Design a protein around this motif. Structure first.
Motif, PDB file in Angstrom:
ATOM      1  N   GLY A 161      51.418  66.086  81.436  1.00  0.00           N
ATOM      2  CA  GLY A 161      50.075  66.062  80.889  1.00  0.00           C
ATOM      3  C   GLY A 161      50.059  65.798  79.395  1.00  0.00           C
ATOM      4  N   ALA A 162      48.940  65.249  78.929  1.00  0.00           N
ATOM      5  CA  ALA A 162      48.761  64.899  77.526  1.00  0.00           C
ATOM      6  C   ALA A 162      47.712  65.844  76.950  1.00  0.00           C
ATOM      7  N   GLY A 163      48.189  66.923  76.338  1.00  0.00           N
ATOM      8  CA  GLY A 163      47.346  67.849  75.609  1.00  0.00           C
ATOM      9  C   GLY A 163      47.544  67.653  74.122  1.00  0.00           C
ATOM     10  N   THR A 164      48.343  68.527  73.502  1.00  0.00           N
ATOM     11  CA  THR A 164      48.784  68.261  72.140  1.00  0.00           C
ATOM     12  C   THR A 164      49.643  67.008  72.063  1.00  0.00           C
ATOM     13  N   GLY A 165      50.198  66.561  73.190  1.00  0.00           N
ATOM     14  CA  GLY A 165      51.060  65.403  73.213  1.00  0.00           C
ATOM     15  C   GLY A 165      52.472  65.658  72.746  1.00  0.00           C
ATOM     16  N   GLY A 166      52.761  66.852  72.228  1.00  0.00           N
ATOM     17  CA  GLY A 166      54.105  67.134  71.760  1.00  0.00           C
ATOM     18  C   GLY A 166      55.136  67.147  72.873  1.00  0.00           C
ATOM     19  N   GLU A 202      45.884  80.060  64.283  1.00  0.00           N
ATOM     20  CA  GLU A 202      46.245  78.911  65.098  1.00  0.00           C
ATOM     21  C   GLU A 202      45.112  78.515  66.034  1.00  0.00           C
ATOM     22  N   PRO A 203      44.650  77.268  65.967  1.00  0.00           N
ATOM     23  CA  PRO A 203      43.720  76.769  66.983  1.00  0.00           C
ATOM     24  C   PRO A 203      44.460  76.447  68.272  1.00  0.00           C
ATOM     25  N   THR A 204      43.879  76.868  69.392  1.00  0.00           N
ATOM     26  CA  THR A 204      44.562  76.726  70.669  1.00  0.00           C
ATOM     27  C   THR A 204      43.545  76.703  71.796  1.00  0.00           C
ATOM     28  N   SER A 205      43.972  76.151  72.930  1.00  0.00           N
ATOM     29  CA  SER A 205      43.240  76.289  74.179  1.00  0.00           C
ATOM     30  C   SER A 205      43.550  77.604  74.882  1.00  0.00           C
ATOM     31  N   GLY A 206      44.486  78.393  74.354  1.00  0.00           N
ATOM     32  CA  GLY A 206      44.772  79.710  74.887  1.00  0.00           C
ATOM     33  C   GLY A 206      46.237  80.057  75.063  1.00  0.00           C
ATOM     34  N   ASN A 207      47.079  79.075  75.388  1.00  0.00           N
ATOM     35  CA  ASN A 207      48.482  79.382  75.659  1.00  0.00           C
ATOM     36  C   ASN A 207      49.299  79.514  74.380  1.00  0.00           C
ATOM     37  N   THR A 208      49.095  78.608  73.420  1.00  0.00           N
ATOM     38  CA  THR A 208      49.757  78.747  72.128  1.00  0.00           C
ATOM     39  C   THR A 208      49.341  80.040  71.442  1.00  0.00           C
ATOM     40  N   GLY A 209      48.073  80.430  71.592  1.00  0.00           N
ATOM     41  CA  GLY A 209      47.654  81.727  71.091  1.00  0.00           C
ATOM     42  C   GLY A 209      48.467  82.857  71.690  1.00  0.00           C
ATOM     43  N   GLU A 242      41.473  72.941  81.625  1.00  0.00           N
ATOM     44  CA  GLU A 242      41.767  73.536  80.329  1.00  0.00           C
ATOM     45  C   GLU A 242      43.189  73.194  79.910  1.00  0.00           C
ATOM     46  N   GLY A 243      43.349  72.764  78.659  1.00  0.00           N
ATOM     47  CA  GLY A 243      44.668  72.539  78.103  1.00  0.00           C
ATOM     48  C   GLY A 243      44.969  71.104  77.718  1.00  0.00           C
ATOM     49  N   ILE A 244      44.461  70.150  78.494  1.00  0.00           N
ATOM     50  CA  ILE A 244      44.774  68.742  78.301  1.00  0.00           C
ATOM     51  C   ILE A 244      43.528  67.997  77.838  1.00  0.00           C
ATOM     52  N   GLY A 245      43.760  66.886  77.146  1.00  0.00           N
ATOM     53  CA  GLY A 245      42.688  66.014  76.713  1.00  0.00           C
ATOM     54  C   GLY A 245      42.009  66.450  75.432  1.00  0.00           C
ATOM     55  N   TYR A 246      41.765  65.500  74.532  1.00  0.00           N
ATOM     56  CA  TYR A 246      41.065  65.774  73.285  1.00  0.00           C
ATOM     57  C   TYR A 246      40.209  64.569  72.920  1.00  0.00           C
ATOM     58  N   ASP A 247      39.305  64.779  71.964  1.00  0.00           N
ATOM     59  CA  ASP A 247      38.453  63.719  71.445  1.00  0.00           C
ATOM     60  C   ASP A 247      39.064  63.014  70.238  1.00  0.00           C
ATOM     61  N   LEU A 257      54.723  71.696  85.193  1.00  0.00           N
ATOM     62  CA  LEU A 257      53.737  72.695  85.591  1.00  0.00           C
ATOM     63  C   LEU A 257      53.487  73.604  84.394  1.00  0.00           C
ATOM     64  N   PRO A 258      52.506  73.287  83.545  1.00  0.00           N
ATOM     65  CA  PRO A 258      52.391  74.007  82.265  1.00  0.00           C
ATOM     66  C   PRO A 258      51.946  75.454  82.390  1.00  0.00           C
ATOM     67  N   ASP A 259      50.957  75.753  83.231  1.00  0.00           N
ATOM     68  CA  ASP A 259      50.298  77.049  83.197  1.00  0.00           C
ATOM     69  C   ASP A 259      50.459  77.798  84.512  1.00  0.00           C
ATOM     70  N   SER A 260      50.288  79.113  84.425  1.00  0.00           N
ATOM     71  CA  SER A 260      50.284  80.011  85.568  1.00  0.00           C
ATOM     72  C   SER A 260      48.857  80.266  86.039  1.00  0.00           C
ATOM     73  N   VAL A 319      54.264  76.754  78.965  1.00  0.00           N
ATOM     74  CA  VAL A 319      55.263  75.975  78.244  1.00  0.00           C
ATOM     75  C   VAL A 319      55.130  76.161  76.735  1.00  0.00           C
ATOM     76  N   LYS A 320      53.915  76.404  76.238  1.00  0.00           N
ATOM     77  CA  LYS A 320      53.686  76.483  74.798  1.00  0.00           C
ATOM     78  C   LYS A 320      54.363  77.685  74.144  1.00  0.00           C
ATOM     79  N   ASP A 321      54.862  78.648  74.929  1.00  0.00           N
ATOM     80  CA  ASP A 321      55.649  79.739  74.355  1.00  0.00           C
ATOM     81  C   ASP A 321      56.831  79.206  73.559  1.00  0.00           C
ATOM     82  N   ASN A 346      46.183  82.920  83.967  1.00  0.00           N
ATOM     83  CA  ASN A 346      45.130  82.609  83.010  1.00  0.00           C
ATOM     84  C   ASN A 346      43.859  82.098  83.675  1.00  0.00           C
ATOM     85  N   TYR A 347      43.935  81.650  84.929  1.00  0.00           N
ATOM     86  CA  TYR A 347      42.762  81.183  85.659  1.00  0.00           C
ATOM     87  C   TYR A 347      42.572  81.974  86.945  1.00  0.00           C
ATOM     88  N   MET A 348      42.907  83.266  86.907  1.00  0.00           N
ATOM     89  CA  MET A 348      42.830  84.094  88.105  1.00  0.00           C
ATOM     90  C   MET A 348      41.391  84.250  88.573  1.00  0.00           C
TER      91      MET A 348
HETATM   92  C1  LIG Z   1      47.010  72.522  73.424  1.00  0.00           C
HETATM   93  C2  LIG Z   1      47.388  73.608  74.063  1.00  0.00           C
HETATM   94  N1  LIG Z   1      47.785  73.522  75.457  1.00  0.00           N
HETATM   95  C3  LIG Z   1      48.685  72.474  75.917  1.00  0.00           C
HETATM   96  C4  LIG Z   1      48.670  72.473  77.447  1.00  0.00           C
HETATM   97  C5  LIG Z   1      48.950  71.352  78.167  1.00  0.00           C
HETATM   98  C6  LIG Z   1      49.358  70.042  77.507  1.00  0.00           C
HETATM   99  O1  LIG Z   1      50.676  70.167  77.088  1.00  0.00           O
HETATM  100  P1  LIG Z   1      51.133  69.456  75.689  1.00  0.00           P
HETATM  101  O2  LIG Z   1      52.604  69.313  75.788  1.00  0.00           O
HETATM  102  O3  LIG Z   1      50.829  70.324  74.503  1.00  0.00           O
HETATM  103  O4  LIG Z   1      50.558  68.076  75.546  1.00  0.00           O
HETATM  104  C7  LIG Z   1      48.923  71.385  79.548  1.00  0.00           C
HETATM  105  N2  LIG Z   1      48.580  72.514  80.192  1.00  0.00           N
HETATM  106  C8  LIG Z   1      48.281  73.620  79.483  1.00  0.00           C
HETATM  107  C9  LIG Z   1      47.895  74.892  80.221  1.00  0.00           C
HETATM  108  C10 LIG Z   1      48.316  73.605  78.099  1.00  0.00           C
HETATM  109  O5  LIG Z   1      47.999  74.766  77.381  1.00  0.00           O
HETATM  110  C11 LIG Z   1      47.403  74.948  73.329  1.00  0.00           C
HETATM  111  O6  LIG Z   1      47.843  75.983  73.901  1.00  0.00           O
HETATM  112  O7  LIG Z   1      46.983  75.005  72.142  1.00  0.00           O
END
Ligand SMILES: C=C(NCc1c(COP(=O)(O)O)cnc(C)c1O)C(=O)O
Ligand SMILES: C=C(NCc1c(COP(=O)(O)O)cnc(C)c1O)C(=O)O
Lengths: 475, 475
Positions: free
Chosen positions: A186-191, A76-83, A237-242, A307-310, A50-52, A313-315
């Motif tokens: 999911g709540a990752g960046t929260g955007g 850009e700091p990322t968990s991998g998908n924004t990168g 990977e992707g969701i949750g932060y401190d 469904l954010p990821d394929s 989705v981050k594309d 990336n976790y094959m």
């Molecule tokens: C923060 C990042 N990932 C968001 C993310 C999320 C969370 O989606 P957000 O809309 O960004 O809150 C869920 N699943 C995956 C695989 C993700 O990569 C990033 O790519 O920098």
């Protein structure tokens, strides 16, 4: 019909989005859910995440404001998908990419961003957000030390929520025709949750919005929900932060669901198995949270899950049952591993060889006999198969059928050594091994040859049809 | 607009196809090609391959003829993608899947079809089509020995070419608006090239059709083109066979191009790098053949190339530069590996540590000191970083910043051992290692610590910014 793709595209950037919505009827029937569980398959975008969208969009905002010129460097700091998304945008529009990602993230993301010509600097997993060894602090340092560098800062840039508010939420609305009762995301960046929930509650205030947070993060409300594993590293990977990102408006979400690693991964495997959506782990977390939240809904109501990821990336990480067994996660309710463990149990190949009846009289050759000599021996011994081996430690198996057909095909000379035509892919086993393990090895090797390894006196060869006949003797 | 996905989908099967066409302007500019090189991104289907269409379609034909009832078993020989498509169709519509695939094919295909609840029996790579140990003969044996089993036989079933003649070729025509000058398409089962070329030559007879065959197969015409490596096993997966399939009409194709493994893989990496299409190796073969064939075309003319597979199925094989180096394939013209080899060369970390200036005075601790003791030592020694190690062999690195922030975050007790807060992800190196190798290791590990390993007397820690400063000293 054909409206969005009926033409030719100028670049891959225009192939981002436009992802379909699929009804998870089979998965709902598996988990006993009455309402319609809809899934927004964001992983079918160009880059498989989705981050594309936000990557493309932040580049567009940087270009419409003139803050971006060709040849610049993007950090850009990322968990991998924004990168991945920003690497695509850069490789297309001619920018240099430098990515900062924690060591916890998978290696496939790193390999893919390396293929995209992006420099990769990794940060320790346990570093807090305040540390200058965090991905964000290191990104700031690189911006300070590099020329023409820019940080788009997906955690605080308004493009990230504004675009999910602009197009993605509108896509969901247009395909659900306005009738949306629950939205689990999911709540990752929260955007994405901020934008989508804001647009939906604007156009459908009766819709509840549920956020998914892994056990370990402090993004859930209230703090009574975070105490399960406070700031404990997790595999998802992707969701949750401190910390709460700048774009996250925690007021737009009504409920919060905490999800652990085991449930996320087992539900991701369940999604793959029952629907056939090659999806990521964070999506397993989201779907598990949705199954827990929308339980009270009734038929006709629609619960939308992202469904954010394929799986791409976790094959190697969680698709492979080996790594899930290494981390002790329940594979699935119905899975091949549990099926093999049920049918075989601890049955070892000693039991199979004993009940079948063999005398370990498998012929051997030094792997450089002429094919004439080996066929003379094969006809004099009446056996069909033979095992070829060297002196310096096995070469493989060899059958008379391949002998004849290769002699006719012009690949096997009469004076040629048997090593040239033998089957060179093999799997070594030993009598103490269970049948489940040889079944797992047969997934990757055609034959399985046994050995005592105390003389190298092998007792026979094992194929899948042998195990099938053995199971035909059972019930 | 939104015509094909503007609604909700009943299952993933309805998400097959509808793949966009992208103009490879950047790749053409890289290789110096005047005409428009269009790419049909078939890998963006639900299962990430073109064969999903024929899988779905053969199931539809088996159901419209009543030859298929629920609970049945489906058997299919495949290189991996048809297995995925039929596994999707079975997991959706409630059929059992049994897949036969050669050992040459990647492990990701096996893992994915295992996740889809499909049984996997593998066959030796060197087996000829006549052998009963070939995937097709073994499939026939399973059909003979299993009840309610069916083989759809993608090599001879008319659904495979008829569907590419029905929808896919019509998709290409509608998006190219009829103007198609050349069509380059790989020759595997031959169904896609047969169908697409037949429909196009019916609706555009002036269009040339070029087939791609790997060096090793006997599908090219005439036999003067196959003698390069006659029946020599090759790494490219999906295309080429040791016999002409039943559905292949070799008369519908005009030209034939032989492609080796090296060109296929390097062109696949070039596609990924320059366009940003996460694509497979067979697509590299197809695009290389297209670049060789459409050289004589002029501007305005369109050369359409098929991209059959995604990187997902070859994520571990050829995306990882390690395996391409193991098989000695040219990485790419512009790649991270060549960039690092150019900047660093054979420069070793001894040279960097000598030119930078260090005395190997990196402090050490037995990894269970109280944090109070370690901060007292850190303040008395004035150093910022420290390396923690055990007696039974390294634990990691630890910085005062993480100390303070974790003490404030409630994760670091004053009496707690330093092992709890140290950074546990590390990469060991030794002074003889080159800078390119530590750069590759930094892609996966945040720090790189050196050691002599003759006392364990490490000289310092290395991060990416250290190499960046070293390169700032160079030019
Ligand atoms: C923060 C990042 N990932 C968001 C993310 C999320 C969370 O989606 P957000 O809309 O960004 O809150 C869920 N699943 C995956 C695989 C993700 O990569 C990033 O790519 O920098
Ligand atoms: C024969 C099979 N593969 C066809 C194929 C091809 C050749 O496409 P055909 O249209 O079937 O000739 C190219 N690339 C990949 C990745 C492929 O999987 C199969 O899946 O059984």
């Amino acid at each position: 019909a054909d409206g969005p793709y009926s033409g030719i595209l100028d670049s891959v950037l225009d192939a981002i989005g436009n992802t379909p919505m699929v009804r998870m009827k089979r998965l709902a029937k598996v988990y006993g859910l009455e309402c319609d569980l809809l899934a927004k398959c964001e992983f079918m975008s160009a880059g498989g995440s989705v981050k594309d969208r936000i990557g493309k969009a932040m580049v567009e905002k940087a270009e419409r404001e003139g803050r971006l010129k060709a040849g610049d460097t993007l950090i850009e700091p990322t968990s991998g998908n924004t990168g991945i998304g920003l690497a695509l945008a850069a490789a297309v529009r001619g920018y240099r990419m430098i990515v900062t990602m924690p060591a916890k993230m998978s290696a496939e993301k790193s390999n893919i961003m390396k293929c995209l010509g992006a420099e990769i600097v990794r940060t320790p997993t346990e570093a807090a957000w305040n540390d200058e060894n965090s991905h964000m602090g290191v990104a700031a340092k690189l911006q300070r030390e590099l020329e023409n560098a820019h940080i788009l800062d997906q955690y605080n840039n308004t493009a990230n929520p504004m675009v999910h508010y602009d197009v993605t939420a509108e896509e969901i609305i247009t395909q659900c025709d306005g009738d949306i009762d629950m939205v689990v995301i999911g709540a990752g960046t929260g955007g994405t949750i901020t934008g989508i929930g804001r647009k939906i509650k604007e156009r459908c205030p009766k819709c509840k919005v549920v956020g998914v947070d892994p056990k370990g993060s402090i993004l859930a409300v209230p703090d009574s929900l975070n105490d399960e594993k406070r700031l404990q590293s997790y595999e998802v990977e992707g969701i949750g932060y401190d910390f709460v990102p700048g774009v996250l408006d925690r007021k737009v979400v009504d409920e919060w669901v905490k999800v652990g690693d085991a449930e996320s991964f087992t539900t991701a495997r369940a999604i793959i198995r029952n629907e056939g959506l090659f999806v990521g782990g964070s999506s397993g977390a989201n779907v598990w949270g949705a199954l827990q939240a929308a339980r009270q809904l009734k038929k006709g109501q629609k619960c939308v899950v992202l469904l954010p990821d394929s799986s791409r990336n976790y094959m190697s990480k969680f698709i492979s049952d080996e790594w899930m067994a290494e981390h002790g996660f329940a594979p699935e309710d119905g899975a091949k591993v549990k099926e093999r463990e049920k049918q075989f149990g601890g049955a070892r190949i000693r039991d199979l060889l004993s009940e079948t009846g063999a005398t370990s009289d498998v012929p051997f050759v030094t792997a450089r006999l002429s094919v004439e000599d080996v066929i003379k021996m094969m006809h004099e011994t009446k056996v069909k198969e033979v095992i070829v081996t060297e002196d310096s430690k096995l070469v493989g198996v060899l059958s008379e059928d391949h002998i004849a057909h290769s002699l006719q095909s012009g690949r096997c000379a009469m004076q040629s050594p048997v090593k040239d035509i033998a089957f060179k892919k093999l799997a070594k086993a030993l009598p103490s091994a269970y049948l489940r393990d040889v079944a797992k090895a047969l997934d990757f090797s055609p034959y399985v040859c046994v050995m005592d390894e105390k003389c190298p006196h092998f007792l026979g060869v094992i194929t899948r049809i042998d195990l099938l006949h053995w199971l035909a003797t059972k019930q």
